[PDB]
Subunit: 232 residues, 5 copies
């Protein structure tokens, strides 16, 4: 049975699964193109893409066998991978800020509320819009604390590579992550049934941008910095 090109959510799942699998191999193998300062970052990136891979196989499974949005798998994957992205965030902060381990506590706290509220909405354990609002709070609390709350502590200019990582991190958590709540709105906040296709299409683009492309930017910083240190 060839892929059904009409099942475009079907195809999206397929594409992203391959993207996850590839990225995963790429992050692990390229660990040797970066130095000890950078290796653990690549491990975590690969680990994030890796877990998404397996969860993508299951997500696609259920879509195709039932045509229902795979909410529980979706959130289980976020539950597992969001904390690790937070760990990448922490790893970056620890290079340029005194408050890195305290921030990590609050960023984690943000993310759990963000995710729990989201899930409540989609699970029908809470009305959609209220749940969206609390979720948004969670996400925004993280942004707040990172740049305006406790995070305002240090913006150490010391390393061009660390500024890049820091820049990339901001970019991902602000515009990067914005794709998910966009997804949630499209699916649940237009006119009450669920617009299941557009929900999943957007979620799928968001995991690609946020798991694969973020990983990719960090690797590029990592390789560039690694190579300049070699020259010297």
């Amino acid at each position: 049975g060839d892929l059904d090109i009409s099942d475009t959510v079907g195809v999206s799942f397929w594409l992203v699964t391959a993207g996850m699998l590839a990225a995963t191999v790429f992050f692990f193998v390229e660990r040797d193109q970066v130095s000890a300062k950078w290796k653990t970052s690549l491990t975590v990136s690969g680990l994030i893409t890796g877990i998404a891979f397996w969860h993508y196989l299951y997500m696609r499974g259920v879509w195709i066998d039932t045509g229902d949005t795979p909410t529980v798998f979706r959130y289980i994957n976020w539950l597992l991978t969001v904390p690790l992205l937070v760990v990448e965030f922490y790893l970056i902060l620890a290079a340029c800020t005194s408050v890195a381990a305290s921030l990590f506590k609050k960023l984690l706290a943000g993310s759990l509320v963000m995710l729990g509220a989201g899930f409540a909405g989609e699970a029908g354990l809470a009305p959609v819009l209220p749940a969206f609002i609390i979720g948004m709070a969670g996400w925004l609390y993280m942004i707040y604390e990172l740049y305006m709350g406790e995070g305002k502590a240090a913006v150490s200019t010391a390393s061009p590579a660390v500024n890049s990582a820091y820049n990339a991190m901001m970019m991902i958590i602000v515009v990067g992550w914005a794709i998910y709540p966009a997804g949630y709105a499209a699916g649940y906040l237009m006119g009450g049934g669920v617009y299941a296709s557009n929900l999943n299409l957007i979620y799928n683009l968001a995991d690609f941008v946020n798991k694969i492309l973020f990983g990719l930017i960090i690797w590029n910083v990592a390789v560039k910095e690694s190579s300049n240190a070699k020259l010297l």
Copy 2:
């Protein structure tokens, strides 16, 4: 079809299965950032998560398929993994302590199993289980443990292995207690076991990793 959310135990199983997979990969890959002094410790850590992963697939499998607590899978998994944790201490008087810790661990698990499998009433089983566990902690003080291991990095490792067997390990008897010694609560029992395996196998290996990476970086830094 989609994962059934109302099955909290099923979900917990899923999550730790993934945690174990992830940790196993992480320990193996990260061996390249720790000196020869630490590599084997990371191997052993990866082995523990590895075995736990396979056993989590089956434990989960049983739960979804029948609703029964996978007691034998659980205990067999501990039987394979707990010895490897004790090995990690020997890697740190040594051969004597290992043998004593092993015996403790085996008395501990044996009694636990006895109770859960119905080969002994649960309370006496709990006491002998507790005795075995308690004997392990004892041997790390007045006993053969008062051999002040020369090496700060060795000490941070040892301290953290000291702490895990005391506070980390307590989650299991807590698990047993919840399930068998309250007013069987299979659901609560499996939730605490899951959490205990998660904390103890992942975080402990994370500790060793952390010490090892720090020690190794410092030692390559003094190579100037």
Copy 3:
């Protein structure tokens, strides 16, 4: 559970190329330790191209044997994932030769996406077969154009030159087998299912394995030469 059907010529070809991508992937990933930092990402990308092909070859061949129909979607999804990856390789190479390298990447991607879009519309019956072929060649020739004339018309290293040529050579001579196969299938005025698949499978072998091999040969030579210091 029987022996491979010998009558089924298309099956044998799928089977073979499947194996070839499998071998190739292992080859490229393993051999990374025979090339320098300057070349390693190339080999990775090379390996990911063949690895992703491998998985899709497994599905393609299963679609063929179980139904006998042509695996258009699996075939195009495969190229959608691998072609940009091949363009990334051109970018990686071109990062030496010019400072305009990031521009070319953007343009070559757009060209190739058009090339595959046209082709797909053709085989999918979303657009008539012959005009689809035309827009197909447009994207392709546009790619070839921007490399030979236009922007890619720019320049300590005797290896980046061979790899450059390798690229210019393959995107012209190598990639040609694809529209050659499309013509064979849909442009004889039914659909020539077997010829199509045989040529595509042949093109994939040549362009994914043999291209990867050329880069490997350049990287290996350069790394052992630069080692003499």
Copy 4:
């Protein structure tokens, strides 16, 4: 359904399967902890544990499914691994004596007689008692050749590591290997019926001792030498 605890043999296969899994990973991954002097040894060590894992999977399948002692799988496994262990013995002996090549041939001949006889017994192609004796002769001919025959050549303490590995080889053939004929006696040479439970339990233990544990001995010696030689 959960593992059945009353099926002792069943549990034994499960434990040993998993041990073979872990040890395979252990011996491969740990190769970067030993010098070029020892790597191939750890490779062969992981191969033996590796091949044994796959066979343990099948052996356990058979038992769980039929209750029959999985003879052919057992001896197929031994046929693939014993020659490898004999290869490891040759490598050690290479560092000790000039007679190393003929010893290897002699030992391979011994072990094949040994395994052939044992198998004929268990598969019912020969009486269980005489097969055992020929089995034992092959085994004993190996031991003889190491201790009194062409192997009385040179103990030659070239290295403290080579000397440790040599002695490890010398012990295992005797004390470690002895578990197998003991298991075979227990299963075929003591009763009315075949004592399959004991037989499988003892073989399981013997694979564990000889593949996993003996592999760890080579690993131990090899890590110590390599770390010492580096400084």
Copy 5:
């Protein structure tokens, strides 16, 4: 159930499958015991045994389910692996002569005629005996070109290791490969198909020529790499 010991060839398939599995692992892992000169060699060797393994798994499936000879899996396996052994030969040849590229194309052409012929026979596409003679000609032409043709161009003392690898290559294509036609002869060239002998001989041939030949190269390479460091 337990493996069926009466099925000699069943068991034969089992034994070489596992040997291919082991040998693939051996060769990839052991690359860190040889220097850059030899690493690709070991990679090709692993690739040969790796392809063989996957094919042996299908070949055994076919022998159990049907009891028939898996002729197409076998030749498909050979079609993938022989070109690779020839690539290996070219790598050996390149350190010994300057006519290596010409030799590679010659030997490959030889080997495809060799395989196409044997297959045509076994598949029933061509009478069994003329097929044998033709396939045999392809082989012999390969042996012609190495000993008396373009191969007469040069030997090499440049290294005693390259000289060993050369010698092994010359030996293998003569005594090693000879096991294959012997098997065909056994199977199709006696009375009115001796399927067991054929398959036993071919499994033996794959073992000697893929696993054992591989081991010889590996050995040359570890000696040479170990001396090089000294």
